[PDB]
């Protein structure tokens, strides 16, 4: 047998691939999701996490300079995430994603960063669409699923540019008011829900001098419930 390297914990062969193959795999997955979302729906979560893993890493230590290498598997992964979440956003990918448990604890951060500069669907705009999808839903996720939803929303908040002025805080504030009006009738009683407090802390950092001013009152009622 060929002398290769093993993972001493599990015994599996360590494998490494070049950017020309990782990028090809990413584009293959992108085409598969693009031309058949219904077939890709069961596998969508794993594919997103696997490609966000590549998006997170840096090809070179030169994080100061933008990775303008033509290959740049990280850039290919960012394009994959951007296109996937732009295409599947009308299909309610955001409430479905934030309700589901995410094994990769860094996927929400990579999604926030890779969509941050996106002009078609910004990370702030992605948050607004997530809120609109959660609010327009006939029934909010059950007590068990709502905790995961709140934790995922808070983790997405941690990676958002909450200090950045934009023409959405006067809209995200109203969306969050209406979304917090429903939580006391949804959340379970004796389960820890510090994620809501994290969301409130993130919200109170927006540069708007008036959005938080109005948001403060549903904050008070939800804090009273908590």
């Amino acid at each position: 047998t060929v002398m290769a390297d093993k993972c001493h914990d599990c015994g599996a062969i360590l494998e490494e691939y070049d950017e020309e193959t990782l990028g090809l795999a990413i584009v293959v997955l992108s085409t598969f999701i693009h031309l058949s979302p219904d077939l890709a729906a069961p596998l969508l979560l794993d594919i997103m996490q696997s490609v966000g893993r590549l998006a997170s890493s840096t090809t070179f230590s030169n994080q100061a300079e933008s990775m303008m290498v033509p290959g740049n598997a990280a850039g290919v992964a960012k394009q994959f995430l951007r296109c996937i979440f732009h295409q599947l956003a009308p299909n309610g990918i955001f409430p479905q994603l934030f309700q589901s448990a995410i094994k990769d604890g860094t996927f929400l951060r990579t999604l926030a960063t890779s969509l941050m500069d996106f002009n078609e669907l910004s990370s702030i705009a992605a948050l607004s669409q997530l809120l609109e999808g959660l609010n327009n839903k006939k029934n909010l996720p059950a007590g068990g699923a709502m905790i995961r939803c709140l934790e995922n929303i808070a983790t997405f908040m941690e990676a958002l540019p909450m200090d950045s002025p934009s023409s959405l805080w006067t809209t995200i504030s109203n969306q969050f008011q209406t979304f917090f009006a429903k939580l006391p009738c949804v959340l379970p009683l004796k389960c820890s829900l510090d994620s809501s407090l994290r969301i409130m802390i993130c919200l109170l950092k927006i540069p708007s001098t008036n959005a938080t001013r109005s948001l403060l009152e549903p904050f008070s009622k939800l804090l009273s419930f908590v």
Partner: peptide, 30 residues
């Protein structure tokens, strides 16, 4: 139109008088 939905298994999916139906839809009736 098709909307994401968590299935019974927990995985994602994309989900969006029979003769009288023909009778009403038939242009002859109109």
């Amino acid at each position: 139109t098709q909307m994401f939905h968590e299935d019974a298994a927990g995985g994602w999916q994309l989900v969006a008088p029979a003769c009288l139906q023909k009778m009403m839809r038939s242009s002859v009736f109109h």
